[PDB]
Amino acid sequence: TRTVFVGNHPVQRFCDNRIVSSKYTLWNFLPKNLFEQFRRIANFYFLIIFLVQVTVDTPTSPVTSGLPLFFVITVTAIKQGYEDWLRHRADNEVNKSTVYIIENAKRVRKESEKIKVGDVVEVQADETFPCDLILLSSCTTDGTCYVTTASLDGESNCKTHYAVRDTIALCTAESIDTLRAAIECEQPQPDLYKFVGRINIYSNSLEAVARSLGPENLLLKGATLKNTEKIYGVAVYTGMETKMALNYQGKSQKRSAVEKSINAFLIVYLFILLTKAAVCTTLKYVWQSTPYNDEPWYNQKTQKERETLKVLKMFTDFLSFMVLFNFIIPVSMYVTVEMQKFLGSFFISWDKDFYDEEINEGALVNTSDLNEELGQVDYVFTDKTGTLTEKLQDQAAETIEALHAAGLKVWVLTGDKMETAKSTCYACRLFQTNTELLELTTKTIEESERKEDRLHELLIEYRKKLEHQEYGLIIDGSTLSLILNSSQDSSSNNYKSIFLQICMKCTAVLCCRMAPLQKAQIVRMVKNLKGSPITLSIGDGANDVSMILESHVGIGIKGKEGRQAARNSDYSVPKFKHLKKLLLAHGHLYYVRIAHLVQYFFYKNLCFILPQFLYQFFCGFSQQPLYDAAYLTMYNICFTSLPILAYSLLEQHINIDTLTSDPRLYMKISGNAMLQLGPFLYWTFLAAFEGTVFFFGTYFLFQTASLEENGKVYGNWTFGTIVFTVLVFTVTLKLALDTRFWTWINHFVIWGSLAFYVFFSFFWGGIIWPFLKQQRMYFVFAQMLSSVSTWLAIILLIFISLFPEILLIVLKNVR
Amino acid sequence: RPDNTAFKQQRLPAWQPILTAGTVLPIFFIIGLIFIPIGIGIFVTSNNIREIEIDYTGTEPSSPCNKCLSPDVTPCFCTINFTLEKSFEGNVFMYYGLSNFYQNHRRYVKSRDDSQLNGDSSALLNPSKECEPYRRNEDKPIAPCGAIMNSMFNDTLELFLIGQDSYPIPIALKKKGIAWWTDKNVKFRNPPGGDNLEERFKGTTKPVNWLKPVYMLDSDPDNNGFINEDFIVWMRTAALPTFRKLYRLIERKSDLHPTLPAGRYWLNVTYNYPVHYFDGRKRMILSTISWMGGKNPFLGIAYIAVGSISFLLGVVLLVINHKY
Ligand SMILES: CCCCCCCCCCCCCCCCCC(=O)OC[C@H](COP(=O)(O)OC[C@H](N)C(=O)O)OC(=O)CCCCCCCCCCCCCCCCC
Ligand SMILES: *[C@@H]1O[C@H](CO)[C@@H](O)[C@H](O)[C@H]1NC(C)=O
Ligand SMILES: *[C@@H]1O[C@H](CO)[C@@H](O)[C@H](O)[C@H]1NC(C)=O
Ligand code: ALF
Ligand SMILES: [Mg+2]
């Protein structure tokens, strides 16, 4: 209930046509983005680790822990800032437009964003309306106008509106004669088809004639005017309150299942690290209880270590152990997954299959964070006019058949009427001849409580009693409005649940006469049930943007309507038939690569660290690193970083030629199988077994009193180098065995990693620089390789460690 | 118009290997048959090495060194008799072992200055921060800084063979060539100032636990300071609480007689190193070597176990897949 005067002349508290779709400003951006980023557990942890390493102690260097975190923060900040500046630029176009206002008996021109409620406005032919107008008159008689809403329902049929009978005659002839009227309206709502109101037009002396206002008088925002020279309307809703601006809902954020699994694995490994550190510090302070086990006359504390507070000492030792064993959670993974996501997205643009000579353009990638998300789609929501039909498109029926063969459920959400919407569904092979149409339109609900009886009849006594293809639901937007909004009157049997079960147990669902927001409501309703089904939405019109921004991954067709949905989506293909190739092969490959990379990155560091934790039982729990600082720094940077990146950027697990020709293979990764508890436990136990085998095999080897033909003993750096060599060879050969698509790049990287490791060991060991405070590794590697016993032991260990994998490979080839 | 490059279109030629049970089955047999003979050879080699260890720490009233456990101003001497059953023919290496001695502790490993032992003049007069509290003594920097150098094993061991009569005959032991050639000739050098060794260490002092300064260890100038073989050998860490270090070398006699004929021997030792303070043990090991090194059956046992577990599994899988 709001009152507005036509000319603001009396016979307020409203906004001012200002559309903002952005979230960050031009100053608060940094504090808000940093707060949003550092709230995550991984980003907090890395920081905490960097600060503790800087403050208390570090084994190798603070730079190797401070630089990659900064790079990771910077890349994401740049991405978010650019994607928000794009929305700022887009809003700048919608605002700062030209409109013509008759303020005081003259055709004043103002800026579009300065509209205030209650002023008569004039728009010429083919001009988009600036706000919610109410028709006062027209250039011609009969008070009619032809308006097409290409941005509200998706079609381009010529609708008709009727002017006010008492006001048709006012055409540029004293229309601002202090026209006494009061437009009493209803509060704005997203119904888009309901409107109650009344006019209080007065006469020269006095009048009280009041004509009711309905949907035939509202002139909606974002609908172009056609076949009319000029009209005159009165703004009632202006900005963030128009029926067009209410159905936006914004974009919150999109995360992948692989990304969530990474966080879960990080949370598990955090507990593993805490348990390791606590056990080590407890055993250390139990072992130091003996008077002669600390300061045994051959190494004594510099008085400080004695004068330090005992209570602070356990906390310092705990921080030192956490820093020493912090390597089990690699920052390299994050830095790498960033490069992989950035570089691998180029293949979609480069692909020659996504090319249409008519549009003379190719595919387009707006974000690179859903490449793995393309390979986990479960539900597909399609738009009828523009996407499915152009008659049908080139391969609309066969693409739907292929999608059905892959185990996906295809729903058609449109804004067209049922009469023309149902025939299109009957032509896309979505509705066969022998299927019973389960119909819930407005043609059968002319009341309120008939729906509850109908739902009970068609769910409880019709269908679940049992034929899985026969029943296909057909619904209307009007019925869905009551189903959604009026479901909070009874609680014994929830309307949403009893309607969701019949939707989900049906073969296909068609929904006609739907507002832009109701599509996002349906998509959101689907997303919450029984876990987390993964949804994909495809559209080409501006009314599809609400459901594109709500689904897990949004695809936007580059069509004749415009690029409104092409820039707001994640990917863009200039056809509908391209979807089969886009998500059958590319998504499968991306998901396989990223899952294998994550699993290998965790396993490679767990097996790296376990021997070092086992070593503490043979020293005095003094936090003595087993390896050299150079090896600790260089392990994840050059020795093992390149083979996994080369594997995860180009590796055909299954050749794309048979991936595209066999849609059935999409079901092998349907439920995130590659990152499940089974594989996680298998990789963790493999790493734990190999880590134990390394350390104990070398410990039993180091009880000889000599390993050379000249009778000379070895130090601890030789022990560490033996363990490190066995480690590097085992972790490289594991991936070499797992590789299935060997290119020249894979050969080069995999063999060059080992060759470079050997050459770097020989080069670092043998030259005194000198710029270091110590020369512990002067000749360790070259002296280590002069013994047949060590050669044979290493050769035996690189086979003992891989025996589980070799046995599993064989067992996976029978029964 | 798009570039039809194999790299851009994901069409790079590849090998695409497909390993199967019917093609990897002979590997399980060949590995076992190449591994078993190696294991047998290695385990047989490990059994033809003779070795004896003599524990001479004391801590027992029936031991001759119980009088050596706690002297005051008396330089203690022991003598332990022992017998050899089978003579030693190969080369003989003298070792000394310590137990419950943590050479790999963090506070003890890093307590050294590797640059000063390299002959650096700047580091000669001022030692590094890490080697504390053995950085300065009596307002004079110690030449070898750190506990790793300060606590060196300093016992004197001499072997005596008892002939047919009661007159013992000594055995010649050589101190040269027991340390790594590379870290003896490159990593450990002497200060370059002057020819006489005593005047090179002017602003330095001997360690606290020392008895004579570091430039008087041996008469030969080649093994006098920072090059002494025992010093260099002790400077190398141990990696385990129980370890052994090379002490002397016994060389072959010119004639074909065995190097150590069987019989009774005498071990006169000079008990200077206290080890009972932290429940440690001292021992001396006389051992021969071979192409592989010391006596340890672990390698042969592991090779035999791996070969057997591979061959049996291969046979089992061969008899199982025969159903098709
Ligand atoms: C807007 C979108 C853009 C998104 C990306 C586009 C392009 C980006 C390019 C950026 C290039 C690299 C980014 C720099 C950030 C890394 C900086 C850096 O040095 O990190 C150092 C890290 C070290 O971590 P860690 O060892 O795992 O352990 C960390 C633990 N917390 C600790 O305590 O310490 O180590 C690492 O994070 C490893 C570095 C990355 C791994 C890949 C490097 C491979 C190169 C190999 C080098 C030589 C190869 C020689 C081998 C020969 C083989 C043929
Ligand atoms: C031998 O070294 C020990 C350990 O420091 C020391 O106590 C003893 O006095 C030394 N014997 C000498 C220098 O004769
Ligand atoms: C070593 O001890 C034995 C045992 O009595 C003795 O005969 C011999 O003279 C001693 N040698 C030295 C150099 O003290
Ligand atoms: F063209 Al529509 F909903 F009818 F996108
Ligand atoms: Mg449209």
Residue numbers in the entry:
A (entry chain A): 19 to 29, 38 to 416, 651 to 726, 743 to 1091
B (entry chain C): 27 to 350
Pull text from the paper.
Closely related P4-ATPases, ATP11A and ATP11C, act as major phospholipid flippases in the plasma membrane of mammalian cells, with strict substrate specificity for phosphatidylserine (PS) and phosphatidylethanolamine (PE), but not for phosphatidylcholine (PC), thereby contributing to the asymmetric distribution of PS and PE across bilayers. A previously reported disease-associated Q84E mutation in ATP11A confers the ability to flip PC, implicating the involvement of this conserved residue in substrate specificity.
To investigate this point further, we evaluated the Gln79Ala (Q79A) mutant of ATP11C. Due to the smaller side chain of Q79A, the binding pocket becomes larger in the direction toward TM1. However, because the Ser91 hydroxyl group remains facing toward the phospholipid binding site, similar to that in WT structure, the shape of the pocket is not widened (i.e., unchanged) towards TM2 or TM4. When we superimposed the occluded PC in Q79E mutant against the Q79A structure, the binding pocket in Q79A mutant is not wide enough to accommodate PC, due to unaltered rotamer conformation of Ser91 compared to that of WT. These observations suggest that the hydroxyl group of Ser91 is inherently oriented toward the phospholipid binding site, and an additional hydrogen bond contribution from Q79E side chain may stabilize it in the opposite direction, which is a key requisite for the widened binding pocket found in the Q79E mutant.
